[PDB]
């Protein structure tokens, strides 16, 4: 069970760790988060009390190094850093733990929510979507634009999600215009699964990462990517049975976790109505259709 | 964006453009079967592709053989339209290719956009105008070449005959839309107005009669009266 110590908390802030969150007061003696489950990616995230604009945070995996948070009064944010001295880090953590200045990652034993949201998400895939190769952790915020949003302006600060565009030469074989537009199976299976992602696990990893960036940061481009990857599967007549079954589980946990009050901005009416009620896969998402109908019947 | 009353003069500028109307592509008669069920029989159709500036009409005849063994024909008809318009553009020299294609029905936008991906600089636009191009099959010589076709065929016409020798494109388009609007509202009465004087004939190489400038004023008035006479019936006003 790993630890992310905080040097201090000089500004009042709501701190997120995965699906959990804690309010910290200005100069409250808060020195970090312990008992973080090994084996998953995690996200630590921030929203300042004095400017709720820019939710921002860090994707990390404690297997990949010793990470800590320190406030930078010049750039005005909580920064993740790596401590390369193992013994210094162990000694910082042991002291803060002894003084019980750390919150405990509050996982209920029965609760598989975080595993279910991050099942296919891998740090090495995150670091290719979020390019900053000198760090082992990845910064995301509310305002970062996607490569696709930029095409339609600082490339170093972009989310490099895989570009999906239903009206592109990539999506449409010359001579199969109607077939490929109405049945996206060749775009899903040859171009995206065989071609770019190599397998369904990498495709689902990106889908899950996009959702979590949409939910935790209100990142609009991430929400666009999440919906496009759902629509590409639901709009394909030919999808492996294991992928449809896995998609239903993925979406079920995403809809289960979404704050009830954010359904208006994070869910696209057209995509969900098309996916659940008109698409090839209208009958393949039983769990997702039942949670959507019971939790968000207005949207439908 | 959408072509409307506001940007109407754009039709007659020097940027090559085409209107595409798919109304008459998939045509059927509905009938009873022996068992008392209903069935359709397809008849020959056409794509109506028109340069509004020059009057050049690209009439692509759609032979009933293209529907044989196909499903969801009203959907397919849109894609076949977009396939044939794309083929026509690729067949034209670069300097003759349109800069814009305006579709009369919004359902043509995605099919035509997807068929024209190779032409990203050709703008595909809808229109707010209610154009009467469905009535093209009320023009006897167009109807005749469509019905007689035994295979897919492209036939080239000038829908303005020689009018541009005497009038502007704007005025020629207004005359064409008024004639087609009359033929659409009351075909019998419109054709009666166009042929009532036996002395005025249609040249072999023309679609419409050889009216003098003064006779066109009388004809256009008789067409406007027909449209109002008809409207004061539809609505009882």
A79 forms beta bridges with A70
Interchain CB contact of A90 with B (< 8 Å): no
- Spatial CA neighbour of B143 closest among B27, B36, B50, B233: B27
- Whether A177 and B76 lie within 8 Å, measured CB to CB: no
Domains of chain B: 9-163 (3.30.420.230), 164-237 (1.20.80.40)
Most B CBs within 10 A among A177, A187, A235, hence the mutation to make, goes to A177
DSSP β-ladder status, A138-141 and A56-60: antiparallel
Experimental technique behind these coordinates? X-ray
- Whether A177 and B111 lie within 8 Å, measured CB to CB: yes
Interchain CB contact of B115 with A (< 8 Å): yes
Distance CA(A110)–CA(A209), nearest Å, equals: 23
- Spatial CA neighbour of A16 closest among A53, A43, A54, A48: A43
From residue A170, give the alpha-carbon distance in Å to each of A234, A286, B113, B151. Answer: 18, 31, 14, 34
From residue A9, give the alpha-carbon distance in Å to each of A12, A56, A98, A101. Answer: 7, 16, 19, 11
- Whether B115 and A177 lie within 8 Å, measured CB to CB: yes
Interchain CB contact of A23 with B (< 8 Å): no
- Spatial CA neighbour of A114 closest among A240, A237, A17, A233: A17
Distance CA(B62)–CA(B84), nearest Å, equals: 10
What is the 3-class SS of chain A, one letter each residue?
CEEEEECCCCCCEEEEECCEEEEECCCCCCCEEEEECCCCCEEEEEEECCCCCCCEEEEECHHHCEEEEEEECCCCEEEEEEECCHHHHHHHHHHHHHCCCCEECCCCCCCCHHHHHHCCCCHHHHHHHCCCCCCCCEEEECCCCEHHHHHCCCHHHCECCCCCCCCCHHHCCCCCHHHHHHCCHHHHHHHHHHHHHCCHHHHHHHHHHHHHHHHHHCCHHHHHHHHHHHHHHHCCCCCCHHHHHHHHHHHHHHHHHCCHHHHHHHCCHHHHHHHHHHCCCCCCCHHHHHHHHHHCCCCC
A23 forms beta bridges with A14
Nearest to A172 among B76, B83, B114 (CB): B114
Nearest-Cα residue of chain A relative to residue B112: A177
Per-residue exposure over A85-113, b if at least 16 CB sit within 10 Å of its own CB, e if not: eeeebeebbeebbeeebbbebebeeeeee
Interchain CB contact of A152 with B (< 8 Å): no
Interchain CB contact of A179 with B (< 8 Å): no
Within a 10 A sphere around the Cβ of B83, how many other Cβ atoms? Answer: 20
Interchain CB contact of B109 with A (< 8 Å): no
Collect all residues with Cβ–Cβ distance below 8 Å to A18 and sequence separation of at least 6: A42, A43, A105, A114
CATH architecture of the domain with residue range A144-300: Alpha Horseshoe (1.25)
Size of interface A-B (CB pairs under 8 A): 23
- Whether B114 and A167 lie within 8 Å, measured CB to CB: yes
Collect all residues with Cβ–Cβ distance below 8 Å to A186 and sequence separation of at least 6: A173, A176, A180
Nearest-Cα residue of chain A relative to residue B87: A175
Asked if the A1-143 domain carries CATH number 2.60.34.20, the reply is yes
The alpha-carbon gap from B118 to the nearest alpha carbon of chain A, in Å, equals 8
Nearest to A178 among B79, B113, B118 (CB): B79
Is the Cβ–Cβ distance between B85 and B47 less than 8 Å?
Answer: yes
Considering only CB atoms, which chain A residues are within 8 Å of B110? Answer: 167, 181
Within a 10 A sphere around the Cβ of A254, how many other Cβ atoms? Answer: 22
From residue A43, give the alpha-carbon distance in Å to each of A52, A75, A256, B194. Answer: 18, 20, 19, 77
Collect all residues with Cβ–Cβ distance below 8 Å to B115 and sequence separation of at least 6: A177, B79, B82, B83, B85, B86
Considering only CB atoms, which chain B residues are within 8 Å of A177? Answer: 79, 82-83, 111, 114-115
Nearest to B113 among A167, A174, A178 (CB): A167
Is the Cβ–Cβ distance between A34 and A97 less than 8 Å?
Answer: yes
The token pair at B192 is 């009666």
Q: What angle do CA B84, B90, B96 make, to 5 degrees?
A: 110
- Whether A172 and B111 lie within 8 Å, measured CB to CB: no
What is the 3-class SS of chain B, one letter each residue?
CCECHHHCHHHHCCCCEEEEECCCCCEEEEEECCCCCEEEEEECEEEEEECCCCCEEEEEEECHHHHCCCCCHHHHHHHHHHHHHHHHHHHCCHHHCCCEEEECCHHHHHHHHHHCCCCCCCEEECECCCCCHHHHHHCHHHHHHHHHCCCCEEEEEECCCCHHHCCCHHHHHHHHHHHHHHHHHCHHHHHHHHHCCCCCCCCCCCCCCCCCHHHHHHHHHHHHHHHHHHHHHHCCC
- Quick one: CA torsion of A50, A56, A59, A65, rounded to 10 degrees? -60
A80 forms beta bridges with A69
Resolution value, angstrom units = 1.5
Distance CA(B9)–CA(B7), nearest Å, equals: 6
Segments making up each domain of chain A, as ranges = 1-143, 144-300
Interchain CB contact of A169 with B (< 8 Å): yes
Distance CA(A217)–CA(A227), nearest Å, equals: 16
The token pair at B10 is 């754009």
CATH topology identical between A1-143 and A144-300: no
The alpha-carbon gap from A167 to the nearest alpha carbon of chain B, in Å, equals 6
- Using left for φ > 0, alpha for ψ between -120 and 50, and beta otherwise, residue B70 falls in beta
Dmax (CA) of chain A: 70
Question: What's the sign of the alpha-carbon dihedral B200, B204, B207, B212?
Answer: negative
Distance CA(B33)–CA(B226), nearest Å, equals: 38
The alpha-carbon gap from B229 to the nearest alpha carbon of chain A, in Å, equals 44
Phi, psi of A15 (to 5 degrees): -105, 125
Most A CBs within 10 A among B75, B81, B111, B114, hence the mutation to make, goes to B114
């Amino acid at each position: 069970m790993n630890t992310v110590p905080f040097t201090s908390a000089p500004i009042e802030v709501t701190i997120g760790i995965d699906q959990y969150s804690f309010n910290v007061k200005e100069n409250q003696p808060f020195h970090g988060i312990k008992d973080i489950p090994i084996g998953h990616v995690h996200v630590i995230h921030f929203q300042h009390a004095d400017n709720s604009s820019m939710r921002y945070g860090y994707w990390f995996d404690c297997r990949m190094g010793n990470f800590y948070i320190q406030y930078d009064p010049k750039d005005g944010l909580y920064k993740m850093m790596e401590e390369r001295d193992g013994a210094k880090f162990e000694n910082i953590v042991h002291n803060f733990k002894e003084r019980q200045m750390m919150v405990s990652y509050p996982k209920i034993d029965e609760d598989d929510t975080w595993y279910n949201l991050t099942e296919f998400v891998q740090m090495d895939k995150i670091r290719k979507i979020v390019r900053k190769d000198e760090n082992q952790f990845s910064y995301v915020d509310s305002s970062m634009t996607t490569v696709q949003e930029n095409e339609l302006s600082d490339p170093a600060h972009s989310l490099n999600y895989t570009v999906i565009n239903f009206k592109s030469r990539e999506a449409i074989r010359p001579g199969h215009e109607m077939e490929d537009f109405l049945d996206k199976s060749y775009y899903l299976n040859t171009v995206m699964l065989q071609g770019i992602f190599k397998n369904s696990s990498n495709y689902f990893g990106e889908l899950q990462f996009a959702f979590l960036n949409a939910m935790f940061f209100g990142n609009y481009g991430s929400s666009l990517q999440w919906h496009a990857m759902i629509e590409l599967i639901c709009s394909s007549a030919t999808v492996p049975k294991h992928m449809l079954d896995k998609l239903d589980e993925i979406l079920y946990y995403q809809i289960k976790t979404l704050p009830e009050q954010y359904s208006d901005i994070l869910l696209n009416e057209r995509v969900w109505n098309i996916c659940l009620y008109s698409s090839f896969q209208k009958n393949s998402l039983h769990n997702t259709e039942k949670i959507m109908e019971n939790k968000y019947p207005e949207l439908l | 964006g959408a072509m409307n009353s506001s940007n109407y003069a754009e039709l007659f500028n020097n940027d090559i453009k085409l209107f595409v109307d798919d109304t008459n592509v998939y045509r059927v008669t509905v009938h009873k079967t022996f068992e008392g069920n209903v069935a359709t029989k397809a008849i020959n159709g056409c794509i109506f592709t028109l340069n509004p500036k020059t009057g050049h009409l690209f009439l692509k005849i759609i032979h009933t053989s293209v529907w044989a063994g196909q499903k969801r024909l009203s959907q397919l008809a849109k894609w076949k339209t977009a396939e044939e318009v794309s083929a026509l553009v690729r067949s034209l020299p670069k300097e003759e290719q349109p800069k814009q294609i305006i579709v009369t029905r919004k359902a043509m936008l995605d099919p035509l956009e997807v068929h024209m991906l190779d032409f990203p600089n050709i703008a595909i636009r809808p229109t707010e105008l209610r154009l009467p191009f469905s009535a093209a099959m009320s023009i006897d010589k167009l109807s005749d070449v469509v019905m007689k076709a035994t295979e897919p065929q492209m036939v080239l016409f000038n829908i303005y005959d020689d009018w541009l020798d005497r009038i502007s494109s704007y005025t020629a388009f207004s005359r064409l839309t008024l004639l087609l609007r009359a033929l659409k509202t009351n075909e019998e009465s419109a054709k009666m107005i166009l042929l009532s004087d036996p002395t005025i004939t249609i040249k072999s190489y023309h679609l419409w009669p050889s009216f003098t400038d003064e006779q066109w004023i009388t004809i256009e008035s008789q067409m406007r009266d027909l449209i109002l006479t008809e409207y004061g019936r539809k609505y009882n006003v």
